[PDB]
Amino acid sequence: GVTPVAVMTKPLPCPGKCIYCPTFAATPQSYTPESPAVLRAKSCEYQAYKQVALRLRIIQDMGHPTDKVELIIMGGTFLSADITYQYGFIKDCYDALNGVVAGSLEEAKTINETAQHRCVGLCIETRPDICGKAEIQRMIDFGTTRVELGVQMLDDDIYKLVERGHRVSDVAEATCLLREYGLKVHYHWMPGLPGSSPEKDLALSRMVFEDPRFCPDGLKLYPTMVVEGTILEQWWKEGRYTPYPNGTMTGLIADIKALVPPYVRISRVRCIREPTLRRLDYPASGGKEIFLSFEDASDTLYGLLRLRIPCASLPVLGQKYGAKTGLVRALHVGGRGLGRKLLAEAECLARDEFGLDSLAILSGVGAREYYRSLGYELVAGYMCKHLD
Amino acid sequence: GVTPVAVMTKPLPCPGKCIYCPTFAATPQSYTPESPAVLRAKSCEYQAYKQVALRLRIIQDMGHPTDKVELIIMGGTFLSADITYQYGFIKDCYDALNGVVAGSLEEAKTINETAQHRCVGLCIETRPDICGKAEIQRMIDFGTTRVELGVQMLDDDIYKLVERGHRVSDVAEATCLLREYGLKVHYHWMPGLPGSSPEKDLALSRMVFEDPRFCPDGLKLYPTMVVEGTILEQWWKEGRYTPYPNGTMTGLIADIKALVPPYVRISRVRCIREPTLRRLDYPASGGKEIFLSFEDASDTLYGLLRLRIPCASLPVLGQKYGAKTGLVRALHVGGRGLGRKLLAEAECLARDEFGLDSLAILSGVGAREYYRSLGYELVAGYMCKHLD
Ligand SMILES: CCNC(=O)CCNC(=O)[C@H](O)C(C)(C)COP(=O)(O)OP(=O)(O)OC[C@H]1O[C@@H](n2cnc3c(N)ncnc32)[C@H](O)[C@@H]1OP(=O)(O)O
Ligand SMILES: CCNC(=O)CCNC(=O)[C@H](O)C(C)(C)COP(=O)(O)OP(=O)(O)OC[C@H]1O[C@@H](n2cnc3c(N)ncnc32)[C@H](O)[C@@H]1OP(=O)(O)O
Ligand code: FES
């Protein structure tokens, strides 16, 4: 029951230095120019406060709730701009949610912990090669809870729809780091990219879900299509690219959804979307991932929890919570008890089965109060508990 | 007294996968379209045999000698094409020099060891990121003796005149490998690139000659200028780039030439171009470089020898020449005795001062016979001697 508030960043230059590169970097929304959010963003001159305020007005006019919100920074190039711009943009978002201006970002965050519109999640689109330790540290300062990597398709010989492009190595290194810091990892997935087949697309889709370097929490399926007035259109006119027949495409995405394991949230534009407690383990980036969930005999999902046994404790946790610290990466229950039941199970598994010294939860600022009522305390952006 | 025979490779696609990239990769000759060799290359449909044959006819018509030749493969993208194309292109070159067709590349090489037109050197333009162990191994099969890296300018934030561009890391890794295999290393150098200053250009030029990761054997100075009908021209029209004033440029290249150490061959488009034996040492890519030379009281250069004490013996030398092997990377004497005198000194320094087990010389095929007359024997493309 979380409402998404998606805003765009201002057009930025290409992160890489190249005279062949375009003036402005390529965004995932370059081939979706008619999305309401994109159209609104342009109308507001890409102002953070103006966008969030306007989007709250639309949601309220529709009669939808706004007490639980997930901010979504769209662009994929956000983390490569001026540091002043990044923090300023985020600070604007929280101010709009709070309805009051603060003196700094951290003040706005702490204010949102108890405001009408809780920011229980904050997602940031970024690219595989723009997602290192430096970039991740900033996302913690923003209160980030989820990341969408512009993977698009998993092969270094398939043309990506952005400038330069990335390597598979960059995807694995970013995915590993994101997990070691307690973040959600979602991949942008778009079959039909130049230099690929319906076979290769589906092949790579099976690999990513049975390859420990990857195995994301969800996919955002972007069916590739020739939007007019774009580079890809030039290739269509020139016969250098031919889209998958409409019937073919609808068939391919269907096969993709079937491959997906149970722990994966398929997003679009078997999958996620009395009950008993279910458990599912799988390796990922060296460590172990534990997918807890509440489901009934009909296999309908009621709530989930993502517990990770990490390889290392990269977080800069306090002196008491030293080494041997586990990470609760997610906890969604779309409201009577399932929450604490799931969190209680994860605590024991970390103490009894893996002998971990404590747990840490990279929660959203608007959800911190929830974990406070269960014995957790804020430490360097994380909600922690000694766990005995 | 070596005659250069410069030929171009066929237009190739961009090594990297990018929809923004151009149709054909960018070459160093894209901003020098009026060079005789470029104009001839287009006229011959970029055929290797046709180019080399025609160039031999021109040189003979001018009355210049052709008994000593250096082949120069121009393009910078050669090593990224079909392996069949690469070996075929090289094999064509040797056939034209020999005046006779052979059954394979190796047969053409061995034939050129004794032909009228000796191929005493073979240079290949390549890019910093297209110069790994795999790429270098092929260049040995071709009989390569020198490499020109498209460094252009040494900063990851300066726009290069090719697509994608490279990092400084790629330049250091390529330079290290090239040295460990006994090759000459020359850098393409062009001040005036978008996003730079006459100050930054000269600053970086001082660094490269006092930084162990670099210190090339020579620079090929490409004064940047706005050739009509090019990307850079678009930037000039759009005021996004302004060239260095003509007077400024001539001044900057002058300051560059003064910085240069004594071991460096400044090429254009203190520097190189009775006598006693001179010695000069300097670190480079972990190992040690020894620059021997014959010069007189007036400091006029008569001949040089480049001896390297490598960190490791990456070459795949025979069983007798095991570890502890030195590399003679160059030996030029622009003809009574200086040659063997220089080579004798290097042999002793390798045996007495550095206790090396043997020496190896990555000579050109047309020069192998020279080293045979001094006790060296061919082994995996190198001319080797046990050295006792
Ligand atoms: C990736 C993590 N994302 C989030 O936590 C934000 C989305 N939140 C949710 O999906 C679910 O509300 C939760 C994960 C918080 C679990 O809530 P659920 O009701 O299913 O289980 P619980 O047994 O813990 O009951 C929730 C209690 O905390 C309250 N609560 C719900 N959300 C919040 C919140 N963000 N902050 C503080 N309190 C909350 C509820 O009001 C309730 O208390 P109440 O009955 O007195 O009103
Ligand atoms: C990077 C290395 N590049 C090369 O070796 C190719 C360019 N060659 C040169 O610059 C010079 O000719 C050399 C490096 C070979 C040194 O020659 P230099 O005459 O100065 O010293 P030397 O005392 O060794 O005398 C050279 C002898 O070898 C002969 N010679 C010269 N070049 C070659 C050659 N490529 N192959 C076989 N023999 C040669 C000469 O004819 C002479 O013998 P000769 O007097 O009976 O005719
Ligand atoms: S155009 Fe900048 S990398 Fe292809």
Side-chain angles (χ1 to χ4, degrees), chain A residues 18-20 22 31 159 164 231, chain B residues 18-20 22 159 164 231:
Chain A
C18 181
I19 67 173
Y20 283 86
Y31 296 79
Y159 290 85
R164 300 190 122 273
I231 293 168
Chain B
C18 181
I19 67 173
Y20 283 86
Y159 290 85
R164 300 190 122 273
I231 293 168

Side-chain angles (χ1 to χ4, degrees), chain A residues 31 84 105 123 128-129 240 253 272 279 285 294 354 358:
Chain A
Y31 296 79
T84 286
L105 173 58
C123 174
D129 57 344
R240 192 177 178 187
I253 82 85
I272 302 187
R279 181 176 177 182
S285 298
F294 264 100
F354 301 98
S358 50

Side-chain angles (χ1 to χ4, degrees), chain B residues 62-95:
Chain B
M62 285 165 54
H64 293 20
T66 54
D67 61 326
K68 278 168 157 170
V69 159
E70 176 177 30
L71 282 171
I72 309 176
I73 317 306
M74 299 189 300
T77 43
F78 176 61
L79 300 171
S80 69
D82 302 325
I83 293 171
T84 286
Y85 176 83
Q86 293 181 41
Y87 283 79
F89 194 98
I90 301 297
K91 193 262 182 177
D92 289 334
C93 292
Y94 284 107
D95 279 349

Side-chain angles (χ1 to χ4, degrees), chain B residues 98-132 134-136 138-150:
Chain B
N98 299 334
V100 313
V101 182
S104 61
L105 173 58
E106 280 295 346
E107 205 201 355
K109 286 166 58 173
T110 305
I111 291 166
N112 187 267
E113 297 185 16
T114 55
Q116 181 191 0
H117 310 132
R118 301 297 184 88
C119 175
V120 305
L122 196 167
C123 174
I124 287 183
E125 295 183 1
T126 190
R127 295 179 176 174
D129 57 344
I130 312 179
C131 191
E135 290 76 4
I136 295 176
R138 290 203 291 284
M139 298 196 274
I140 301 190
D141 290 331
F142 306 158
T144 311
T145 68
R146 181 161 65 86
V147 176
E148 288 184 0
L149 291 175

Side-chain angles (χ1 to χ4, degrees), chain B residues 362-380:
Chain B
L362 187 59
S363 167
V365 303
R368 292 173 172 175
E369 282 299 322
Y370 172 78
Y371 298 100
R372 285 196 183 95
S373 73
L374 302 173
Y376 289 79
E377 54 182 0
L378 188 69
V379 176

Side-chain angles (χ1 to χ4, degrees), chain A residues 80-116:
Chain A
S80 69
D82 302 325
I83 293 171
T84 286
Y85 176 83
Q86 293 181 41
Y87 283 79
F89 194 98
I90 301 297
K91 193 262 182 177
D92 289 334
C93 292
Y94 284 107
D95 279 349
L97 297 178
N98 299 334
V100 313
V101 182
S104 61
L105 173 58
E106 280 295 346
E107 205 201 355
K109 286 166 58 173
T110 305
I111 291 166
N112 187 267
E113 297 185 16
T114 55
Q116 181 191 0

